[PDB]
């Protein structure tokens, strides 16, 4: 008896929230933006090529200083780059080649990276010794780390192949809240600008939002087909974008509790691997299986430009925190910085 | 360019020098997946060849370094982490021949052999491994040669010759797996019947790797 009653109550509540979402859906962002001036062609050009990695780049992240960027590769090397002058500021030998993810702290003191060893290794850049070394290995994940984001120098949130995210105290080296509500394994994180909320995407094509202290999912967004590879918050924090193997990108608004826009064009047949907004929020930048980045007017959903410069799968994007540039990483082993 | 920026460019060239000297090492290693249908004799070949998350093992044999990635600890969705291994020289794959009349513990409906065929087809015909050869160990040789006297191979397959002698049964397992390869021109399956002497199992990896690398070189040269 009871399991079928609870399954009918799950069906009833799923039906109630889709009706509640469709009730507050009084317009579309395409209608609301009918009057605005379009972006026009975003002809960005490669101002640097960072050309020291010897295998596929899997992740990169900017410092808050918006001049340094970390990147990681299958070479088992993570590099911090001076993006202004192409210098390798540091290169870090990882304990493992298999770097699915990296992140760089809001103060630039620390770097994190994950992998197919489920450990998040955290590296102290600003030691009194001149070599970068590990602070913690955050071992308690059951599947590969897909994403990392520092809230601050002593708290990181991670997401994994085990269908969980976790928030760690980096001092004691242990989970503090742990987040389990997905059913597919989890592929991407983004923090809200206030870093109290975050949102993560999984292979069930649900994106779920959390509060890091409440320890529990507030909202579930599920407009995607297939599987979500990529997430970014829109810079106001009230919305986020998602990139899938369903070749569309999608913009979800938290207060609307649902999908606003769907960025697809009929000749992008292939997965989005990474996403970022530009500083105003006006451009989505999205990285693809088909070897380039597309650039989208995030309000109109027209394709505003292309970052064509890669000879293998773009696996990363990041717009600098000052908005000045976009780095792109790819499986061709070069980063290219565009403005 | 300032006195500090000249020293920072130097540092960057020092990083590059050593970062490239590490590539000169990492390109000389041979990179191998190791795959198998759960507990499948995989751990036995790992200890023979040496004597959380993925386990990576190192060996050198006849003056050639191998890196072998036992990925079997990643229980989750291969579609989102197997693309790491696109640069692998050869997959090593394991099947315990004893699995023909054992059944899969999560439902007890499907034979462990059919579960390992689902995995072999799944890795073999996948887009990242299209040029990547598979070494295929067939692991628990002795226990299969004993058990087939007690339990005929038709308990696995609706279709078989019904011969049930060890040699034609074992060669029918090999035939049933090599028939899963949808691209026999781009990749060759190197099947081996695993044996008690460590160096015989290692020599087969060295042979199949050397032959894969020669067939890759001949495909570069235009001799193929």
């Amino acid at each position, epitope marked *: 008896s009871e399991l079928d009653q609870l399954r009918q109550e799950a069906e009833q509540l799923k039906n109630q929230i889709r009706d509640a979402r469709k009730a507050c859906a009084d317009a579309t962002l395409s209608q609301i933006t009918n009057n605005i001036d379009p972006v026009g062609r975003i002809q960005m050009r490669t101002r640097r090529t960072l050309r020291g990695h010897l295998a596929k780049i899997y992740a990169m992240h900017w410092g808050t*200083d918006s*001049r*340094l960027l970390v990147s990681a590769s299958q070479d088992g090397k993570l590099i911090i780059w*001076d993006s*202004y002058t192409t*210098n390798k*500021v*540091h290169a870090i030998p990882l304990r493992s080649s298999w770097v699915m993810t990296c992140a760089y702290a809001p103060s*630039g003191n620390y770097v994190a990276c994950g992998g197919l060893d489920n450990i998040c290794s955290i590296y102290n850049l*600003k030691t*009194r*010794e*001149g*070599n970068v070394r590990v602070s913690r290995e955050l071992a308690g994940h059951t599947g590969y780390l897909s994403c990392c984001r520092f809230l601050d120098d002593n708290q990181i949130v991670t997401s994994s192949g085990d269908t969980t995210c976790a928030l760690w105290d980096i001092e004691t080296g242990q989970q503090t809240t742990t987040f389990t509500g997905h059913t597919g394994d989890v592929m991407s994180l983004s923090l809200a600008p206030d870093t109290r909320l975050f949102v993560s995407g999984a292979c069930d094509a649900s994106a779920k939002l959390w509060d890091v202290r409440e320890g529990m999912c507030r909202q579930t967004f599920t407009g995607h087909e297939s599987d979500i590879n990529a997430i970014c918050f829109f810079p106001n924090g009230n919305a986020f974008a998602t990139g899938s193997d369903d070749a569309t990108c999608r913009l979800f608004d938290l207060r609307a509790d649902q999908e606003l826009m769907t960025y697809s064009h009929d000749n992008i047949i292939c997965g989005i691997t990474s996403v970022s907004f530009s500083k105003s929020g006006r451009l989505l930048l999205a990285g693809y299986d088909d070897f380039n980045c597309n650039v989208w007017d995030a309000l109109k959903a027209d394709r505003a430009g292309v970052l064509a410069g890669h000879d293998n799968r773009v696996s990363c994007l990041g717009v600098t925190d000052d908005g000045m540039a976009v780095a792109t990483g790819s499986w061709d082993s070069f980063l290219k910085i565009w403005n | 360019l*300032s*006195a*500090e*920026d*000249k*020293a*920072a460019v*130097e*540092r960057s*060239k*020092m990083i590059d*020098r050593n970062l490239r000297e590490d590539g000169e090492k990492a390109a000389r290693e041979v990179k191998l997946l190791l795959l198998g249908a759960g507990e499948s004799g995989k751990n036995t070949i790992v200890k023979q060849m040496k004597i959380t998350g993925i386990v990576e093992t190192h060996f050198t044999f006849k003056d050639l370094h191998f890196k072998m990635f036992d990925v079997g600890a990643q229980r989750s969705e291969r579609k989102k982490w197997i693309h790491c291994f696109e640069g692998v020289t050869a997959i090593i794959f394991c099947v315990a021949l004893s699995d023909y009349d054992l059944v899969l513990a999560e439902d007890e409906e499907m034979n462990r052999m059919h579960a390992s065929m689902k995995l072999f087809d799944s890795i073999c015909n996948n887009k990242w491994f299209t040029d990547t050869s598979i070494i295929l160990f067939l692991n628990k040789k002795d226990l299969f040669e004993e058990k087939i006297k007690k339990s005929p191979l038709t308990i696995c397959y609706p279709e078989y010759a019904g011969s049930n002698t060890y040699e034609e049964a074992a060669a029918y397992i090999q035939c049933q797996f090599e028939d899963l390869n949808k691209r026999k021109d781009t990749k060759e399956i190197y099947t081996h019947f695993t044996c008690s002497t460590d160096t015989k199992n290692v020599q087969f990896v060295f042979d199949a790797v050397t032959d894969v690398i020669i067939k890759n070189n001949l495909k570069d040269c235009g001799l193929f």
Partner: single-chain antibody
Amino acid sequence: DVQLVESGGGLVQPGGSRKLSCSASGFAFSSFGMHWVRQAPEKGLEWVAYISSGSGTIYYADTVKGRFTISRDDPKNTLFLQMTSLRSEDTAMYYCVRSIYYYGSSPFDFWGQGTTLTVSSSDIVMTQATSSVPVTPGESVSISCRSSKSLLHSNGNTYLYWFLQRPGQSPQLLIYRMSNLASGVPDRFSGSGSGTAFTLTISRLEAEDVGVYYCMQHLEYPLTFGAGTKLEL
């Protein structure tokens, strides 16, 4: 702790020879550029020589160019300075000094305790507003320094370093460019400037702020210190 210890030298005859040695320990020495700096008895600092991290990019001051050779052995974490035709003008305490160069780094951040050497018997001039000032704890002080060239470089960062040498100590970095404090330095100190003239302010002195303060420039080799202002209790 990070350490720089200097088996060094002692007495020599003038026109003689000596090998200064500086064994580093407790840090990744192979990655640091190493300087030597010196200090004649009751005088200001002179930069002497440099090696970068890769053992390339050696430099010297014109007072020692060709007479001294600077050398390193990274497998022993050791730096050397081999001294030939030692003049009476080479009588000084010599400090081995580490430096590391990358964006946001603090070079000159740790100094060896120093070796005496003693003898029997074209660049930016840096200068400071006085020989000394009188002080007491809880006051505020604004030390000042002047450069014979603009130290504000086209890349935007300004190569004024500030050091404190406490009585009988080896020097310590306070501030690495005009305004960036070192690690291990308290929030009392704060530097600023126009690009040719500069200040180090100490916001609320403590008795540990007694000592001699040197500005230095790092825009060009040869590196040049001011003759340091004493703060006197």
